[PDB]
């Protein structure tokens, strides 16, 4: 939960500062998945490259409440990720088969969620996860549809 | 096009640390004068400190900010004094004092500029001492102990929330009980902000003279532990003072209180002198960072905006208090819709057969 | 490790109370995998749709022993799940390729395990996991057998 | 058919909470009278409270149950008294008292219905005070402090286990050291169960009169911390009293002890009056729940059964102690064999080729 | 984080002592993946077959610092494992598609890493992970190459 | 051949536990004489204890080793004494003493073989008592309390690091203040190593006679809590003494100090006798183990080697201190290159089509 990274290519400050230019477009409207991929690419690389917990700093911790609350969120997030169904061509992040309606979720709800708000005009994450969980079952998505099987089976 | 919901587990975004959070770690590089945790290393990427960024985020609970602006706690100098009784007819005590940058209490403008005080939500802990101990060995080494004062000071009482601190604050004063109205009932601060910046290499002297003996209170070598009480109740944050104290040098004093006969009545004098300062560095570690600049907080819409502001990890004595500090952390995963040029697929198995047939 | 879920379809009480009727049949004999799927369906949905830890309740915890022990069991369970081999058509829960013998494991051992017992007449989970670990290796199960390859390779 | 072993990570089953577990959190909605943790919100799904369920489970360690039945701890009223010395020739003390539903100690039927006591496994902690402090400020606010008594009370000593509690219990009594046998050696409880239920809106009065001064003990505003010692050794559970106290109103008293001359010898009187009660609510949070009904515990086969029982989250003053409370938690993953109509498959790749050939 | 395993086939002492003979060869030069598979086989079986946390020992813990630091390392290791791409035929451990250069990483760096050293002559794990992360993306490895598609598409 | 990088999450390797680690759990099987944690069960696999292994590993921080060799802490006997004042003109105190295997302080060869002492890094905690309490109930049960001594003892001051311990050590001595130089200023240890091994079944006696009263210090029933201070700063390790104490029996003494007139001046005598010993067992749990044998530590290259050494879980009174103990833990995941006979593949989908075409 605490690391000292000296030999990484980019630190946490550079990852956050360099991505802020592209984050303006992400806050305004829907972008392509390639655009999202470029925006998060260096952040995902940083968080897959730490080696071991800095023992010099870890053994000095007196109050464990903040560390335990942080670990609980990470454990919950990993559990939900293990259950998701993702597109095969993208591995940095997960693209679900849930189609975006834009009538149930106006873009202003998405912008407020990206800003870190949790008011009554913000996108409801718990309700969205329930909808994605029911629509992403393996028996509904693993087998390609008729239009794909017939197209490849031309002879 | 086909637009789908996507989950990004490690976005390059940040979240503000609020008063409802539990305390975080701040590392100082000098064990002699400041308690732990201790780390004397430089930032892991010293070349990245000070990169500029534009920030526009929301929050749910009030953010923790330090500086001179609405929604941020103002800094000021605090004095911790050690008193050693002396058996002599011409002196009362010998003194050791430390002055450092700390959190500023609010001021009662009705009284003689005294602190605003509160009695709400008294915590459990060892009470602050009211009497000078008769045995104090190793005065050169300073021992910091957590302490609960007789009353809490108020650091903020406005629409941004109510912040109070049950740690003691020390000042010079006269008893003025059993005396006439001539006894001055005002408190005196032996050091001011200028003593930490102006003329560091020069000798500093301070003198106090009165016809009444000088008392120090509240006693206790204890650092601020502020918390929010309205409109939400949160835990104490005893690490915020570590960031402020590193923005300036800390000054070490020594002196005495002596007595002499003036106008056939006792005359009491306090002398303090200093020619020593100590520079410090305070840092936070990833995933925590600091945002430094012209931070603006809007309590009606719960928005934080800051244009052309720097990202930092460490605070030292070159900090300019024209700017303000916002505590932030790397954010958790988010949900975002993105568009593809083909329908969602689970495996490339159909794709593979496409070039197999072409390869026949 | 503590959440306040207001906008979910079913709470923990409703999930537990409604599944109790079907749990009677599960305690008596072997059921079909479709039957098990309907029984656990709403419970799995509830535990995949919590959003963030309730900070108001979490920051008041004084003794962390019970929370840490709970998190350790969850972390161990996730590690074992990452190693299991599951049937492709079911994604809510894992079906292993281990055949049930019923001569080594009489049904009374299974019923006692479902009731939460750990006596000497209960099914030994550690011994069962060792058998499943050795029998589920990828080089023994990923390639379909001869009877399946020949059946599809008719021409 | 093909039957395979399956793992269900989130089964809709429950597990009993036992005395070998570590303490869990119980939230009360009144910070003025009860220590934290505090939560004043209603249950997240108020429409689901009270759903009926049939339960038949086993256990390894003795379950935690509250109520009047074998294997469950009986509730009773406990009194905490704050007493302030008074400088007057006709009065001894002024009193503030709180009465609440708590855990009932066992009774010695050999003696004058005194509590059964034990000296085994004395914990570390601050000893309970034996003397009244000379001054007490802010009597209106009640400060709860953990305390270790001179001896532990026994809550259960049967085939279901041995439960003891090292927190103090307070009663009125007379100092019979250096006295004759005319002094009563009995101990008096100023409040009983009826004072928390019957006639809430009416005024309650209690009077005690004797020729010997009245003393209160053991002192200390401390709540029960029971634990199991036989046949297994487990940690203290200081949260169980929070559930019982919300099942009734709590009553606040005030009064004094006064002295007057009767039959040419001192006569001591204790007066207490009350016209104030406070309702409370206590809740547990998921994944913890409560099972309420006719819970039956069989220690020979280690089975818990309960027919037509309700699932709840919160306890309030409308609770009926005809029922009993069992603490439960959502269970961990389980292993179950299930049958399919086809052999186990790893991927649908063979399945896909089936309709590809059909599509040619 | 603490278990009492009575009915397992091999304990931690036997697993460590029996593998020491083969560990001598692993410290000297590169071995085959079959050799590595046999060396780690019993250790992986032991750590996939523990049932539940020993409650008698866990409830007596006074200082939680060492337990929490251990859990943090395990959680980080699981997060990185979820992101790796592994060869299909080996499931006990992950073989990445990163080719070993031996000009950037001399064998002495590998031996020092296996011994538990972290000096300046030891293999840099953080730098190695960054190379593997960038070279293992799904759009570069999931689709078999031309030499494999052409070889099987002979008719 | 094709050589690829591979990650092994659970390797059958071990790592040494260092002084920069936080304390681990050591379980003893006797609650009457030793504080917790308690476990009286035998090792889960008793048939595996004592398997031989060859070890050659490195480290980053100094390893924790016990025994007689460079880089390991030497064991020795420590005495804890309980003193009860006696109201009698011929006796001063009644004594209860416990002797056990513990950690050996270094010796000043310039003085009368006194302990090497240090004042660096004084921790926070309750100071050790300097006066005998006027009353002590339940002398048979021994209560262990953490304590901070007036000074720290030094356990190691060489190129392997500096280890100091702020727990007290007790010995017999004379005040020799206000007296002449005839007063002996040397400390006496009432028990030695031989009292724990030789002639366990027989009765042991110890007598001390002098013309000056005997005092015991430092007081406090407190066990060692060593820590490293150079070249790195690490936490205290209060569990290491638990492993050494189980290597021998512990001896329980009782006695008194009496006074009689010899040569027309007071004569003081201390008598102690014992006929009772208690055997113990101390164990660590997986993923922790113990390496026992001829452990060699090389500080220049930071290597630990041990040939034909055993792996253990528990220490009992049959331990031979010719060997030494190294604390180890199961290691984390490692990266290793391995060679395959075919190129890397993601799925067997291409492989499956190979036998489909063959099956046509
Ligand atoms: C914790 O981390 C903080 C980080 O700030 C360290 O603080 C630094 O401490 C060093 C050492 O004390 C300071 O360096 C000293 O600065 C002074 C000179 O700089 C001033 O004067 C020059 C011109 O004369 C100006 O350009 C400059 O801006 C400053 O105004 C002197 O006090 C010292 O000079 C000594 O060393 C030099 C070089 O060796 C010699 O030529 C001199 O004769 C003399 O011996 C010294 O250079 C530094 O300024 C501090 N940084 C700050 C305040 O930001 C702490 O030291 C560190 N603590 C620990 C325990 O590690
Ligand atoms: C913590 O959570 C608990 C949950 O139990 C709350 O307790 C409730 O508190 C409220 C407010 O004090 C109680 O409501 C009060 O009930 C009484 C009236 O109801 C009784 O009498 C009528 C007939 O007169 C009967 O029909 C009924 O069954 C009851 O026997 C009165 O004491 C109060 O009346 C007051 O308010 C009403 C409405 O505004 C006015 O008309 C009256 O004039 C008067 O002002 C009041 O309604 C409620 O009963 C409690 N619930 C219980 C005991 O289960 C705690 O308040 C809460 N604490 C905090 C700090 O949040
Ligand atoms: C915590 O764990 C430790 C683990 O060591 C236990 O220690 C053992 O305790 C038992 C019980 O006290 C000890 O057994 C006793 O040993 C003695 C006999 O053995 C000695 O003598 C014979 C020859 O006479 C030698 O061969 C042998 O090596 C020993 O030198 C006697 O004191 C006892 O005999 C009693 O029992 C026997 C059998 O029932 C009777 O015949 C006798 O009459 C007599 O009643 C007894 O056998 C054992 O030696 C200890 N192990 C050691 C020291 O390694 C602790 O008991 C345990 N504590 C708890 C609370 O669980
Ligand atoms: C995209 O979302 C719209 C709107 O969704 C609705 O509004 C959101 C803001 C949220 O509150 C949602 O929970 C809410 O459903 C969907 O359109 C909706 O379709 C449903 C089903 O066809 C309509 O319900 C029917 O409507 C009429 C009138 O009652 C009758 O035929 C039926 O009785 C039935 O109620 C619903 O009216 C309609 N809502 C709107 C605002 O048009 C839309 O289906 C969805 N797109 C998808 C799922 O592809
Ligand atoms: C993510 O990190 C990568 C690096 O790993 C960033 O790519 C880098 O972007 C910079 C700025 O565009 C490139 O610098 C360029 O270099 C030459 C001159 O030296 C010239 O082409 C340009 O003028 C520019 O300065 C740099 O080469 C490039 N590094 C690469 C491709 O390896 C990327 O911008 C980061 N993205 C985000 C969103 O943070
Ligand atoms: C799991 O949750 C689902 C809902 O997400 C439950 O299905 C629901 O079951 C109820 C009770 O059978 C259905 O109500 C039915 O409605 C109509 C009348 O309105 C009529 O068909 C019946 O009389 C009945 O009342 C409800 O429609 C249905 N909801 C659906 C299908 O979306 C399910 O029972 C739960 N299962 C378990 C095991 O908890
Ligand atoms: C991993 O564990 C397995 C067991 O699960 C170990 O295999 C076992 O190895 C031993 C020693 O070689 C075999 O014993 C042999 O048995 C017969 C006589 O009974 C004879 O061939 C030899 O003299 C030898 O004693 C044992 O059968 C075998 N068990 C099996 C195959 O089930 C294996 O060695 C372990 N490997 C590591 C690296 O720890
Ligand atoms: C305050 O002034 C006193 C008195 O001059 C200083 O103490 C003296 O320091 C000098 C210089 O090192 C020593 O030689 C003397 O022995 C000290 N004592 C006396 C009585 O002269 C003191 O250092 C000054 N304090 C500070 C904080 O600078
Ligand atoms: C708990 O079990 C009881 C006893 O089996 C159930 O009550 C019976 O339900 C059946 C089925 O509807 C009725 O025919 C009987 O008349 C009921 N009463 C009896 C046998 O006394 C009860 O419904 C179950 N409760 C729950 C919540 O499932
Ligand atoms: C109950 O009586 C005992 C016994 O008299 C009291 O303890 C005595 O207190 C007096 C106070 O003047 C002392 O002089 C005695 O030495 C004490 N005796 C002992 C044996 O300690 C005790 O204080 C009384 N308790 C209360 C609550 O009144
Ligand atoms: C017990 O009775 C006393 C005495 O009547 C009550 O105290 C008085 O309360 C009234 C009503 O608010 C006030 O006007 C008086 O000033 C109070 N003091 C006196 C001396 O009369 C007291 O409130 C009652 N206690 C409880 C718990 O109801
Ligand atoms: C040290 O010797 C004393 C004195 O003999 C022992 O105490 C006696 O033990 C015997 C044998 O059990 C009892 O009958 C006596 O009542 C004890 N007291 C006295 C005053 O004689 C004591 O047990 C010995 N101590 C040890 C540790 O062996
Ligand atoms: C297979 O199981 C089904 C229920 O799933 C049952 O009806 C059928 O009889 C079984 N087949 C047998 C026993 O041959």
Swiss-Prot record, chains B, D, F:
Disulfide pattern: none
Segments on the Extracellular side according to the record's topology features: 1-360
Origin superkingdom: Eukaryota
Glycosylation sites: 1, 29, 54, 175, 256, 273
Lipid bilayer topology: Peripheral membrane protein
Compartments it resides in: Cell membrane
Protein name according to UniProt: Surface protein
Organism expressing this protein natively: Homo sapiens (Human)
């Amino acid at each position: 939960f605490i690391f000292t990274l000296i030999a990484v290519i980019m630190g946490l400050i550079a990852v956050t500062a360099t991505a802020a230019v592209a984050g303006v477009a992400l806050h305004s409207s829907v972008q392509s998945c390639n655009f999202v991929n470029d925006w998060q690419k260096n952040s995902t690389r940083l968080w897959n490259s730490q080696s071991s917990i800095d023992q010099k700093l870890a053994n000095q911790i007196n109050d464990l409440r903040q560390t335990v609350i942080w670990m609980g969120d990470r454990l919950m997030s990993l559990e939900h990720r293990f259950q998701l169904q993702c597109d095969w061509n993208t591995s940095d992040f997960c693209i679900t088969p849930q189609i975006y309606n834009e009538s149930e979720h106006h873009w202003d709800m998405v912008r407020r969620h990206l800003q870190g708000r949790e008011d009554n005009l913000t996108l409801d994450i718990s309700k969205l996860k329930e909808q994605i969980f029911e629509a992403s079952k393996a028996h509904l998505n693993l087998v390609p549809g008729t239009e794909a099987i017939a197209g490849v089976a031309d002879g | 096009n086909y637009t789908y919901w996507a989950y990004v587990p490690f976005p390059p975004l940040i979240r503000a640390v609020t008063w409802m959070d539990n305390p975080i770690e701040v590392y100082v590089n000098d064990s002699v004068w400041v308690p732990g945790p201790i780390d004397d290393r430089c930032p892991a990427k010293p070349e990245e400190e000070g990169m500029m960024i534009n920030i526009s985020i929301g929050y749910r609970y009030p953010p923790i900010c330090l500086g001179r602006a609405p929604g941020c706690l103002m800094p000021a100098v605090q004095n911790w004094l050690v008193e050693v009784p002396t058996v002599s007819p011409i002196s009362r005590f010998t003194y050791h004092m430390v002055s450092g940058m700390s959190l500023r209490p609010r001021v009662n403008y009705l009284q003689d500029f005294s602190y605003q005080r509160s009695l709400k939500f008294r915590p459990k802990g060892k009470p602050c001492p009211k009497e000078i101990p008769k045995e104090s060995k190793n005065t050169e080494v300073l021992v910091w102990e957590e302490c609960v004062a007789n009353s809490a000071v108020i650091l903020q009482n406005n629409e941004f929330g109510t912040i109070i601190d049950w740690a003691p604050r020390g000042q010079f004063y006269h008893n003025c009980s059993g005396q006439t109205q001539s006894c001055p009932s005002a408190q005196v601060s032996p050091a001011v902000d200028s003593d930490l910046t102006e003329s560091l290499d020069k000798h500093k002297h301070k003198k106090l003279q009165s016809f009444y003996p000088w008392e120090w209170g509240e006693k206790g070598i204890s650092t601020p532990r502020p918390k929010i009480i309205s409109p939400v109740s949160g835990p104490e944050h005893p690490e915020l003072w570590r960031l402020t104290v590193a923005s300036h040098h800390i000054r070490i004093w020594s002196g005495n209180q002596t007595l002499e006969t003036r106008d056939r009545k006792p005359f009491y004098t306090v002398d303090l002198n200093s020619s020593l300062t100590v520079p410090l560095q305070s840092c936070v570690k990833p995933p925590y960072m600091l945002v430094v600049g012209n931070i603006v907080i809007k309590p009606d819409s719960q928005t934080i905006t800051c244009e052309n502001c720097r990202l930092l990890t460490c605070i030292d004595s070159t900090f300019n208090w024209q700017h303000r500090i916002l505590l932030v952390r790397a954010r958790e995963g988010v949900w975002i819709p993105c568009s593809m040029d083909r329908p969602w697929e689970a495996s490339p198995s159909i794709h593979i057969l496409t070039e197999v047939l072409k390869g026949v």
